[PDB]
Write a protein that binds this DNA or RNA. Structure first.
Lengths: 267, 274
DNA sequence: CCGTTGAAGCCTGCTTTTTTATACTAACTTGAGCGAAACGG
């Protein structure tokens, strides 16, 4: 079906759980009951999001089965899908500096990757894949991997809510870090995306904070960046920099989720 | 009684013959029907299962021809839908399957590549070079480029009647590509001196040429140049795609759309300050 | 300075007003087992 590598692994992770939670008996013999018995078994453990992906992947498995002469109906399209609200909190500006000072004990690239992920508002994965050759005439050509949307971030961008410049942070990664990638390690070599966030969680718990539910993360730097880019300049600006095009998430990525009250001014 | 699959496919072809469509179009469907003949046994429609339909479909998907599977699946489905209308069966066992999503793998053409092909077209006759520059200066399709007569040119214009869509436009004899070094006027007059016939693009015998030979000989100069690509080597039709790509950065985007013959709208965007 | 009268209060059946849809697609994030680099004897 032409997949993007990683996505394929996700499916296999959901299929390996079905064969372990459901007998290897005939498909036509598989009633709707035995499908909800296993499904609900993962809903009580708090894994509500898991039950949604398992039922969606298992349901599609039967649609293909019906197409190849195996079964007549899908007994998975009869069960309900478990809704799951986001428990991940949002990051604030006053919380950003706190983690900034708690990253002192941490390597140097962590204090630069955090400032570069809030000034450009780029994805973590596409943040560790940007070479110094992707910067021409003061423009940072970034090609996302998720959606695959290309953009150009001008070096003339700075946040007055944190006191950081993109031209000052960029050059601060050429001397301290030094490498083929804007964000390298202590060995002048690239760094995985599943490690840049790891070192960020350490300073989080060490900074001694306190949130409601699931604590923020490195990915939250993209949310805080857009939240500031919406009041600093405009809304049409923090909609293209993130690589977004639709007009449905421009209001969802603006929410607060119950962190800080939406202060309504005279305007 | 009178059932069976094949018996229906014979009474189905006549139905499409009265639909009132293009000639070449009707032929495309026929080639799909013949494939179904040697792809499925001769038995009543109510006996054909969804399994056998997907067994033949996927067989063409694995061979590499995923695109063909889509049309054959979309055509075979129409036959049954018209079969139910007559009262033959009750259900369409083809609407249960799923068409295989195919991605276009025909590489595009650049400016450097075109220059390498035009020069390699030396061994080729004296009408190919003219057909190349013309197909890029007009950005028209190979089908109409062969049906262009010198009578179409009226007071500095170029009346072109697209056969595919049917759009009617007039390309002025003042255009000029500023990237390859070609001029509409200088190109047309070059065809009146060298060629010399009733049609803008003729043969060495002063006679019109088919649209299947214009792109055929173009292929020879493609593999003779010695250029490597990624996927399937571009074709003569790509000159139309290269034409627009150039005019969009030479004049305007609204100009390329009007030149190609489009009406409605349907890479590295810039993030402005405001 | 005890006894009657009226602004409220819940039970039921309506009568509206704000949110979220369905689904592949593509990631992100905290374990834990594992191999190589770098410092202590």
């Amino acid at each position: 079906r032409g997949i993007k590598q990683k996505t394929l692994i996700n499916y296999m992770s959901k299929i390996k759980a079905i064969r372990r939670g459901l007998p290897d008996a005939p498909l036509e013999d598989i009633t709707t009951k035995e499908i909800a018995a296993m499904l609900n078994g993962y809903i009580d453990e708090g894994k509500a999001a898991s039950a949604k992906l398992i039922r969606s992947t298992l349901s599609d498995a039967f649609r293909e089965a019906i197409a190849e002469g195996h079964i007549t109906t899908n007994h998975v399209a009869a069960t309900r899908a478990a809704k799951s609200e986001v428990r991940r909190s949002r990051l604030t500006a006053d919380e950003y500096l706190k983690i900034y000072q708690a990253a002192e004990s941490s390597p140097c690239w962590l204090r630069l990757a955090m400032e570069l992920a809030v000034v450009t508002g780029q994805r973590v994965g596409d943040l560790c894949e940007m070479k110094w050759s992707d910067i021409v005439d003061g423009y940072l050509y970034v090609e996302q991997s998720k959606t695959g949307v290309k953009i150009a971030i001008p070096t003339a961008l700075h946040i007055d809510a944190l006191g950081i410049s993109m031209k000052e942070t960029l050059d601060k990664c050429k001397e301290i870090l030094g490498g083929e990638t804007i964000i390298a390690s202590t060995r002048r070599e690239p760094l995985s995306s599943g490690t840049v966030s790891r070192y960020f969680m350490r300073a989080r718990k060490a900074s001694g904070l306190s949130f409601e539910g699931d604590p923020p993360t490195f990915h939250e730097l993209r949310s805080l960046s857009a939240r500031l880019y919406e009041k600093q300049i405009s809304d049409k600006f923090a909609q293209h920099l993130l690589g977004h095009k639709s007009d449905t998430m421009a209001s969802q990525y603006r929410d607060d989720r119950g962190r800080e009250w939406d202060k309504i001014e005279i305007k | 009684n009178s059932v069976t699959l094949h018996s229906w496919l014979d009474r189905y072809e006549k139905i499409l013959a009265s639909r009132g469509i293009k000639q070449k179009t009707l032929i495309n469907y026929m080639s799909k029907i013949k494939a179904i003949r040697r792809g499925l046994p001769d038995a009543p429609l109510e006996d054909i299962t969804t399994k056998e339909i997907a067994a033949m479909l996927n067989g063409y998907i694995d061979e590499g021809k995923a695109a063909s599977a889509k049309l054959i699946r979309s055509t075979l489905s129409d036959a049954f839908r018209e079969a139910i209308a007559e009262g033959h069966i009750t259900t369409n066992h083809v609407a249960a399957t799923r068409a295989a999503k195919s991605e276009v793998r025909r590489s595009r053409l650049t400016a450097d590549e075109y220059l390498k092909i035009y020069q390699a077209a030396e061994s080729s006759p004296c009408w190919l070079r003219l057909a190349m520059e013309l197909a890029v200066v007009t950005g028209q399709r190979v089908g109409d480029l062969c049906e262009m007569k010198w009578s179409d040119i009226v007071d500095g214009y170029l009346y072109v009647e697209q056969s595919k869509t049917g759009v009617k436009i007039a390309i002025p004899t003042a255009l000029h590509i500023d990237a390859l070094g070609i001029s509409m006027k200088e190109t047309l007059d070059k065809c009146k001196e060298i060629l010399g016939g009733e049609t803008i693009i003729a043969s060495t015998r002063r006679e019109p040429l088919s649209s299947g030979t214009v792109s055929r000989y173009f292929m020879r100069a493609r593999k003779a140049s010695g250029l490597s690509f990624e996927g399937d080597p571009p074709t003569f039709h790509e000159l139309r795609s290269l034409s627009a790509r150039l005019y969009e950065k030479q004049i305007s985007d609204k100009f390329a759309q009007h030149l190609l013959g489009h009406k409605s709208d349907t890479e590295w965007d810039k993030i402005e300050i405001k």
